[PDB]
Design a protein around this ligand. Structure first.
Ligand SMILES: [Zn+2]
Ligand SMILES: [Zn+2]
Ligand SMILES: [Zn+2]
Length: 87
DNA sequence: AGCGTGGGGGT
DNA sequence: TACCCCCACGC
């Protein structure tokens, strides 16, 4: 982890320079990525992408439990739901 | 529940 | 650099 953060009081280090740069957006508040539907801005392009599904209704991630028809916008929502079917 | 927004991995 | 994500914590 040679890419250290020099912002005041921060101790984080990273293996990649792009991951240090992404991290530093927390300190500066920079939000490079904008939703073309509602104009909200986001720190990260992947989170803009999943945000956009809140407008389109697309729910790609389907429960695989027999006779359950629930679907989800994001993979981790489906992880949480599968965890629940088991208990 | 639905989703904001970190870290970490890959290509 | 640009995207593709999973995992995770939190409200
Ligand atoms: Zn920092
Ligand atoms: Zn939007
Ligand atoms: Zn289900």
């Amino acid at each position: 982890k040679p890419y250290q953060c020099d912002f005041k009081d921060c101790e984080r280090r990273f293996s990649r320079s792009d991951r240090l740069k992404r991290h530093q957006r927390r300190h500066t508040g920079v939000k490079p990525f904008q939703c073309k539907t509602c104009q909200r801005k986001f720190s990260r392009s992947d989170h803009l992408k999943t945000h956009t599904r809140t407008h389109t209704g697309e729910k790609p991630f389907s429960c695989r439990w027999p006779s359950c028809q629930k679907k989800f916008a994001r993979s981790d929502e489906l992880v949480r739901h599968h965890n629940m079917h088991q208990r």
